[PDB]
Write a protein that binds this ligand. Structure first.
Ligand SMILES: [Cl-]
Ligand SMILES: [Cl-]
Ligand SMILES: [Cl-]
Ligand SMILES: [Cl-]
Ligand SMILES: [Mg+2]
Length: 340
């Protein structure tokens, strides 16, 4: 649905983007998942060449800060799941202020005024290998997963984030810790099962697919849906006690060489066309409710047993509390003691 519509970017912005002719993206969205968006954007605007830099969340931050400080060529658009890092940059002078004509109905907690925008509503899910755990054996609660991880067969068979090496692994597990008391019991059960910690979804998924691990906790439902299309052994379980949802944050570099191309791409991501392509084809869980496909808010809400079971991390300067050293210290001390 909406596959032929045109985002409402101002015609002067389209003409300015044509004069630029190029768009440099730094993104943590795996290119496997991003590629259909890039292809569809080029169908709309064939006069823009896209350079897609598929990078780690901490690496995007470090590279962009370093390049900016050097006065050097950097990204036009930054698109990352490490919400706190994106909100920090966009609240420190790095962002081009732009009021997207596609974001008029965004809630105030899904945008930083005109500086940065939510593009997705992506759940942290459980993935497992059906050869080793049947669907009916996989709990959908933190307390139930804690019980499963007492079992001898689960020792060495669990993957989760390393929040000390992945910035979004921090986002997700910090939010879980903050919102769900049962997270503490589950983290001790990660210690019991000798959970292996990964800095990327692909590294954890490769282990689940090989059966080195049976179950991975906290990775993106978007990537799981897309992997399941080619790996029929991959199962997905949604948490019914409460689901953390991240919002991938996009903003335009204030110092972009191609700011208008970046405007068009932001407006594309936020548009009904882009959000429908997420939900239907890319299998990225869309931010917009008015979407058709597998990767939709309605589908997430049905899977978890209602919208009130989803904690959507806001695109807000309030989330920078998570970067406070004492707040980071409390979480990481708890984590490191529980998972050892
Ligand atoms: Cl609002
Ligand atoms: Cl890793
Ligand atoms: Cl549209
Ligand atoms: Cl909508
Ligand atoms: Mg990635």
């Amino acid at each position: 649905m909406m596959q032929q519509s045109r985002p409402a970017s101002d015609p002067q912005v389209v003409e300015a983007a044509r004069k630029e002719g190029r768009l440099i993206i730094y993104s943590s969205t795996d290119q496997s998942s991003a590629q259909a968006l890039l292809d569809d954007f080029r169908k709309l605007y064939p006069f823009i060449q896209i350079e897609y830099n598929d990078l780690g969340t901490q690496a995007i931050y470090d590279r962009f800060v370093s390049e900016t400080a050097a006065g050097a060529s950097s990204a036009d658009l930054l698109w990352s799941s490490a919400m706190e890092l994106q909100v920090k940059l966009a609240s420190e002078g790095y962002a081009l202020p732009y009021d997207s004509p596609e974001a008029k109905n965004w809630p105030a907690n899904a945008r930083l005024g005109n500086l940065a925008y939510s593009t997705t509503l992506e759940p942290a899910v459980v993935v497992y290998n059906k050869r080793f755990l049947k669907p009916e054996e996989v709990p959908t609660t933190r307390e139930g997963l804690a019980r499963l991880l007492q079992e001898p067969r689960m020792r060495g068979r669990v993957a989760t984030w390393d929040p000390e090496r992945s910035a979004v692994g921090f986002t997700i597990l910090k939010a879980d810790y903050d919102r769900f008391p049962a997270f503490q019991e589950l983290a001790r059960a990660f210690g019991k099962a000798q959970a292996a910690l990964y800095s990327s979804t692909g590294a954890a998924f490769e282990k689940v697919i090989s059966g080195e691990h049976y179950l991975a906790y906290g990775f993106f439902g978007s990537y799981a849906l897309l992997r399941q299309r080619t790996v029929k052994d991959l199962g997905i379980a949604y948490l019914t006690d409460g689901t953390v949802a991240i919002q991938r944050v996009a903003f335009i570099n204030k110092r972009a060489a191609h700011p208008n191309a970046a405007k068009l791409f932001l407006d594309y991501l936020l548009s009904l066309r882009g959000q429908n392509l997420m939900a239907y084809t890319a299998l990225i869980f869309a931010r917009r409710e008015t979407v058709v496909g597998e990767a939709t808010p309605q589908a997430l809400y049905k899977a978890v047993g209602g919208k009130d079971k989803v904690y959507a991390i806001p695109v807000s300067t309030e989330i920078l509390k998570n970067l406070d050293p004492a707040e980071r210290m409390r979480f990481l001390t708890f984590w490191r003691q529980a998972v050892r």
